Structure 1
């Protein structure tokens, strides 16, 4: 203001995110990996390799243990948290003898996924390291109530860690967009054909987007009113979203 010479004016911060980047072979993101109790998709090995930290939520360990025979010492979690109402005795044993940190989380008011994030967040600050994103595998298939629980974890996550969290399983990815403006880069080449915007918690009364086939212009998104599913990209390679309330972004993963 009071300075002289050219001076940038106008400007509002925007959240610039690239969803499926962790799925890119090369690149150097810096992310943590969380394995939930669900069948592991083949992309897990590559994701594990470059992850800064890996962990498993209860049953998640069973799935990891069973899909890494002959090379399990190459897939040793930094820690396995949960309540152990899912991990098999022998699996709990193996990881404990190899040095894995087994953390018990009894709380019956919260899922192991949520509790696992709490442990992860703590290990993050406690190890003075920071991540650009937390990649969660599984949680979108199987039991319906659990799928919803996963979505609800993304809500609580805002109070657990400042690091963005994405959930991936089979051909889907979800990411909760907090109120404000977002710039999502969907030009990694790993993108599928569909995408969508789900009002999960409450109606989003003012949504505006760009880069979609069916864009919103200060529109209302709400169950029973209008939910964007089976939407697609305009080809620009960029999607911007502005929402007044938490809005769930979902997109397809190639192949």
Structure 2
């Protein structure tokens, strides 16, 4: 047996700062995935420091259409998806510029999901160390596609170990796996609202600290209770313990 002072009774929690990638400074290691939605202005800052940048289908069009005059400074490592979704001249441009154009036929999975699978393969091949995968898009447009985006977060647990967030306009979503989470919301990029959405199944035991309306061993479920328009207590930290995957959503300032 060991002797002397020994640590006891600790447990593991998943710490994460959702909006860290939006900060000017820092040394966060992350990849960037551009989906088929109009690009927000923040894509410029995020593009610079990303370790790997990719586009899924039509995302290449949106990237191309917002980078005229400086497209050589915005060349994705790769572009994957259905190639009928990319305009002819756009595909021609990225191809000649050396971008890896990867076809992903599979009619049972979205280009987003297929794009993550390709990204994971590249992360491994290049032995990259990634703290998060930042996805731009997916939360606007066709309602079925917004839902597909959410479902991709559920499938991702089987695609990659790296945390994945999705950001579009003023919103971010991130899927909290069963367990305890420590979310730092003190970057100063945070907006005023947040929420906890029990999308796949009711979360029968949710406990939080840091919210205006906290949950204490409470049930969150559609038709029972869903936390929307929640806000922070000002502590700069939100903790969440959930028994099933629970979708965290939060506002992005401005």
**TM-score (structure 2 length as normaliser):** 1.00
Q: Give ranges in structure 2 of 5+ residues lacking alignment.
A: none
Task: Identify the residue that residue 114 of structure 2 maps to in structure 1.
Answer: 115
Q: What SS does the corresponding residue of 1:215 show, helix, strand or coil?
A: coil
Per-residue CA distance 1:95-133 (angstroms, 9 max, x = gap): 000000000000000000000000000000010111000
Q: What SS does the corresponding residue of 1:248 show, helix, strand or coil?
A: strand
- Offset, 1:85: 2.7
Q: What SS does the corresponding residue of 2:90 show, helix, strand or coil?
A: helix
Q: Give ranges in structure 1 of 5+ residues lacking alignment.
A: none
Q: Distance in 2 between matches of 1:95 and 1:35?
A: 14
- Offset, 1:37: 0.2
Q: Distance in 2 between matches of 1:61 and 1:3?
A: 58
Q: Distance in 1 between matches of 2:55 and 2:242?
A: 33
- Offset, 1:247: 0.1
Task: Identify the residue that residue 192 of structure 1 maps to in structure 2.
Answer: 191
Q: Distance in 2 between matches of 1:18 and 1:112?
A: 27
Task: Identify the residue that residue 206 of structure 2 maps to in structure 1.
Answer: 207
- Offset, 1:86: 1.0
Per-residue CA distance 1:199-220 (angstroms, 9 max, x = gap): 0000000000000000000000
Per-residue CA distance 1:54-111 (angstroms, 9 max, x = gap): 0000000000000000000000000000011310011000000000000000000000
Q: Distance in 1 between matches of 2:14 and 2:66?
A: 36
Q: Distance in 2 between matches of 1:132 and 1:85?
A: 32
Q: Distance in 2 between matches of 1:62 and 1:88?
A: 7
Per-residue CA distance 1:170-220 (angstroms, 9 max, x = gap): 000000000000000000000000000000000000000000000000000
Q: What SS does the corresponding residue of 1:48 show, helix, strand or coil?
A: helix
Q: Distance in 2 between matches of 1:199 and 1:85?
A: 35
Q: Distance in 2 between matches of 1:85 and 1:149?
A: 20
Q: What SS does the corresponding residue of 1:37 show, helix, strand or coil?
A: coil
Q: Distance in 2 between matches of 1:163 and 1:130?
A: 9
**Structural RMSD (CA):** 0.4
Q: What SS does the corresponding residue of 2:60 show, helix, strand or coil?
A: helix
Q: What SS does the corresponding residue of 1:10 show, helix, strand or coil?
A: coil
Moved over 2 A (4+): none
Q: Distance in 1 between matches of 2:207 and 2:62?
A: 40
- Would you say how many aligned residue pairs link Structure 1 and Structure 2? 254
- Offset, 1:156: 0.2
Q: Distance in 2 between matches of 1:139 and 1:28?
A: 26
